[PDB]
RNA sequence: GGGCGGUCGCCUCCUAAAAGGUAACGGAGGCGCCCAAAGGUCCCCUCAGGCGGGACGGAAAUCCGCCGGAGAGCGCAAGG
RNA sequence: GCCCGGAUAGCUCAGUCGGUAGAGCAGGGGAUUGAAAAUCCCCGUGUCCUUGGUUCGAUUCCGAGUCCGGGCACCA
RNA sequence: AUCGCAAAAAGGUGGGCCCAGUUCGGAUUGGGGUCUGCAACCCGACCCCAUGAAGCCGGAAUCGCUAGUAAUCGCGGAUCAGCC
């Protein structure tokens, strides 16, 4: 989802990754 | 004495948490942890929650002196 | 969010901190709050704009790191009600 | 049989001489009894009446309490004659200690709240009503009948006099200060 | 299969029913198995007999006990109205208090469409 | 004075003048019942309030200690 | 006192010929109609008389009557 | 214009979340750690964390849509530091 804290595309609607899921 | 309803209060025995926990009288052998946890004047049992754990970079003095700067 | 640099504005940095000098009376006039209040005095009373005018604020060492951004009272909100809708 | 017992004859009768006491045999300050009342609570758990507290109650010190009526029907609480609401107890034998010394060391902690209760809940004649709240989350029960809070009240009577002499006693039996 | 929290999810994979535990959630529950070598498919219900029991140990080391942080819930609103401040009353008057929009969307800590007269 | 209105029997207090009785369209009130226990015998306990407290609790729920000799209660109005 | 037909939601009512159920108001805003009336829409209120029994049941059948009526007596 | 923007998205030949008010789903939340930036609070993105209230397709009939048209998915600007 898209407005979620932590999705697959979550961070692609907010900006930035996550400190679990990061760039690379 | 009664007996009937009464029950005759079976032995148990606690897992010895804080010394020996006083004997064996209900059946409710189970306890979390620490039966007394301290010696009770209560000698500050802290767990360092929200409050002071953390300690550096912040409640110290930085940005300089002790701010004669003032006026 | 807040950082290693724990910012206070340099108009009102160290002109708030003229207690630490001798010791004067228990108020001293600064503005901001997006600015630290500042740390090295504690247990006076600083007085501040807090946001509809300038009232004073007292710490009663419950500050660790917590944020002063907390205190601003200017939307005086008496209740409920009072609405007319329909237009 | 033997619980705490040391530290109730030589932690209690020789600390009562020399600064407090008359020091003959009797008047040096003892326990007498501890009533222990559930008191429905708030208020009514249910329009009739199950019985279930002289269980679980039961459980935890291995006794039935009493249930016991109520006053005149004022009504204004849905107060009603019959029906008994009381669950009292008082229980005062060496099966007071088989409890008391259970309760004693598992209550101060194991709950949570500002660390101990009251100097100043003693009273005249030196009676002492304690007031813990809740106590259904650890009296090492398991959750077992998690109807409310539910809590219980408890009063542990001093037989001398004032407050510096159930004073003298209590919280060198093992009671907190200062709240 | 007993879980090491409370409330049992009723027999679901190790991600699902481990998760909603009380101080667990999805990054707890995510590594809190890969260090242990439970395959993060496999079911609650399909686990060793003994790892039923012996998963319970690591989640109860740090964290304060259920019920007691969600009594710090309300009592971190306590401590930050050391003196009263406008924040508790922020709080207290039912309706979000970060500073959103409270006449259309944040709907939430308000009542759901409770008291008009007009 | 009659009519209109009120009342027609029983119980309680006063009027009722320290035995009993005693009137008025004199004052204040109740009743046409109810309890298989709200009965008999035997065995335990003493109430209502006030003070000091409590975890909720109205200042009244339930509990402890002291004072409280009958100001409570005794199915129902009043008297004993 | 024998016999006769029934007690449904502040109000009263759609009922069964044993397997169903409620619509209307002082009520708030509501596609409406170009923002006007409310035509029309969500909606606040069932021991279906008290109780026993064929019955898969009872929101409905049958028995005593406590609830109200007409006829019929009978009242020392 | 290659060099690097970016990841093109269901492409997965995947293991599963088993009718669930449920890892489908979701915000408000008070503490810590990184800021591009005088400075992010009450006006940083919201970053692993806390925690996840509402929702099983809606009424009196509306209203963007005729074959590359709906529909989730995927990319950049423009004042531009986050981005509101
Ligand atoms: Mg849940
Ligand atoms: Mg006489
Ligand atoms: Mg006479
Ligand atoms: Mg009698
Ligand atoms: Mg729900
Ligand atoms: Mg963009």
Same mark, same amino acid.
């Given at each position: 989802?898209?407005?979620?804290?932590?999705?697959?595309?979550?961070?692609?609607?907010?900006?930035?990754?996550?400190?679990?899921?990061?760039?690379? | 004495?009664?007996?009937?309803?009464?029950?005759?209060? =079976?032995?148990?025995?606690?897992?010895?948490?804080?010394?020996?926990?006083?004997?064996?009288?209900?059946?409710?052998?189970?306890?979390?942890?620490?039966?007394?946890?301290?010696?009770?004047?209560?000698?500050?049992?802290?767990?360092?929650?929200?409050?002071?754990?953390?300690? =550096?970079?912040?409640?110290?003095?930085?940005?300089?002196?002790?701010?004669?700067?003032?006026? | 969010?807040?950082?290693?640099?724990?910012?206070?504005?340099?108009?009102?940095?160290?002109?708030?901190?003229?207690?630490?000098?001798?010791? /004067?009376?228990?108020?001293?006039?600064?503005?901001?709050?997006?600015?630290?209040?500042?740390?090295?005095?504690?247990?006076?009373?600083?007085?501040? +704009?807090?946001?509809?005018?300038?009232?004073?604020?007292?710490?009663? /060492?419950?500050?660790?790191?917590?944020?002063?951004?907390?205190?601003?009272?200017?939307?005086? +909100?008496?209740?409920?009600?009072?609405?007319?809708?329909?237009? | 049989?033997?619980?705490?017992? %040391?530290? @109730? @004859?030589?932690?209690?009768?020789?600390?009562?001489?020399?600064?407090?006491? @008359?020091?003959?045999?009797?008047?040096?300050?003892?326990?007498?009894?501890?009533?222990?009342?559930?008191?429905?609570?708030?208020?009514?758990?249910?329009?009739?009446?199950?019985?279930?507290?002289?269980?679980?109650?039961?459980?935890?010190?291995?006794?039935?309490?009493?249930?016991?009526?109520?006053?005149?029907?004022?009504?204004?609480?849905?107060?009603?004659?019959?029906?008994?609401?009381?669950?009292?107890?008082?229980?005062?034998?060496?099966?007071?200690?088989?409890? !008391?010394?259970?309760?004693?060391?598992?209550?101060?902690?194991?709950?949570?709240?500002?660390?101990? !209760?009251?100097?100043?809940?003693?009273?005249?004649?030196?009676?002492?009503?304690?007031?813990?709240?809740?106590?259904?989350?650890?009296?090492?029960?398991?959750?077992?009948?998690?109807?409310?809070? %539910?809590?219980?009240?408890?009063?542990?009577?001093?037989?001398?006099?004032?407050?510096?002499?159930?004073?003298? !006693?209590?919280?060198?039996?093992?009671?907190?200060?200062?709240? | 299969?007993?879980?090491?929290?409370?409330?049992?999810?009723?027999?679901?994979? *190790?991600? *699902?029913?481990?998760?909603?535990?009380?101080?667990?959630? $999805?990054?707890?529950?995510?590594?809190?198995?890969?260090?242990?070598?439970?395959? &993060?498919?496999?079911? *609650?219900?399909?686990?060793?007999?003994?790892?039923?029991?012996?998963?319970?140990?690591?989640?109860?080391?740090?964290? $304060?006990?259920?019920?007691?942080?969600?009594?710090?819930?309300?009592?971190?609103? $306590?401590?930050?109205?050391?003196?009263?401040?406008?924040?508790?009353?922020?709080?207290?008057?039912?309706? &979000?208090?970060?500073?959103?929009?409270?006449?259309?969307?944040?709907?939430?800590? $308000?009542?759901?469409?409770?008291?008009?007269?007009?």
């Amino acid at each position: 989802g898209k407005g979620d804290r932590r999705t697959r595309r979550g961070k692609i609607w907010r900006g930035t990754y996550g400190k679990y899921r990061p760039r690379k | 004495m009664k007996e009937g309803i009464h029950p005759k209060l =079976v032995p148990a025995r606690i897992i010895c948490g804080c010394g020996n926990v006083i004997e064996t009288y209900s059946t409710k052998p189970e306890i979390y942890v620490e039966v007394c946890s301290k010696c009770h004047p209560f000698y500050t049992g802290q767990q360092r929650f929200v409050d002071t754990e953390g300690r =550096v970079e912040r409640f110290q003095r930085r940005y300089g002196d002790s701010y004669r700067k003032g006026r | 969010s807040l950082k290693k640099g724990v910012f206070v504005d340099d108009h009102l940095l160290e002109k708030v901190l003229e207690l630490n000098a001798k010791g /004067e009376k228990r108020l001293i006039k600064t503005w901001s709050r997006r600015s630290t209040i500042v740390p090295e005095m504690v247990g006076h009373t600083i007085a501040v +704009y807090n946001g509809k005018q300038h009232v004073p604020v007292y710490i009663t /060492e419950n500050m660790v790191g917590h944020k002063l951004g907390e205190f601003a009272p200017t939307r005086t +909100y008496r209740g409920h009600g009072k609405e007319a809708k329909a237009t | 049989d033997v619980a705490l017992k %040391r530290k @109730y @004859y030589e932690e209690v009768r020789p600390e009562l001489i020399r600064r407090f006491g @008359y020091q003959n045999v009797w008047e040096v300050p003892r326990l007498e009894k501890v009533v222990i009342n559930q008191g429905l609570g708030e208020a009514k758990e249910d329009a009739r009446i199950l019985e279930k507290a002289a269980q679980e109650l039961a459980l935890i010190t291995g006794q039935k309490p009493a249930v016991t009526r109520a006053k005149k029907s004022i009504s204004n609480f849905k107060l009603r004659k019959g029906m008994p609401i009381g669950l009292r107890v008082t229980l005062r034998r060496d099966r007071m200690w088989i409890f !008391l010394e259970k309760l004693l060391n598992v209550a101060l902690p194991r709950i949570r709240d500002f660390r101990g !209760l009251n100097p100043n809940s003693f009273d005249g004649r030196g009676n002492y009503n304690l007031g813990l709240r809740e106590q259904l989350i650890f009296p090492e029960i398991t959750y077992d009948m998690v109807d409310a809070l %539910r809590g219980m009240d408890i009063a542990v009577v001093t037989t001398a006099e004032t407050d510096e002499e159930a004073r003298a !006693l209590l919280e060198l039996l093992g009671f907190p200060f200062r709240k | 299969a007993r879980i090491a929290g409370v409330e049992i999810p009723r027999n679901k994979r *190790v991600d *699902v029913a481990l998760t909603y535990i009380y101080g667990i959630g $999805k990054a707890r529950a995510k590594e809190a198995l890969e260090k242990t070598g439970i395959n &993060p498919a496999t079911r *609650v219900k399909d686990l060793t007999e003994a790892e039923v029991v012996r998963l319970r140990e690591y989640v109860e080391n740090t964290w $304060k006990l259920e019920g007691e942080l969600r009594a710090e819930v309300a009592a971190n609103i $306590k401590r930050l109205m050391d003196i009263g401040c406008y924040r508790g009353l922020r709080h207290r008057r039912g309706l &979000p208090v970060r500073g959103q929009r409270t006449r259309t969307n944040a709907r939430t800590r $308000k009542g759901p469409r409770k008291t008009v007269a007009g």
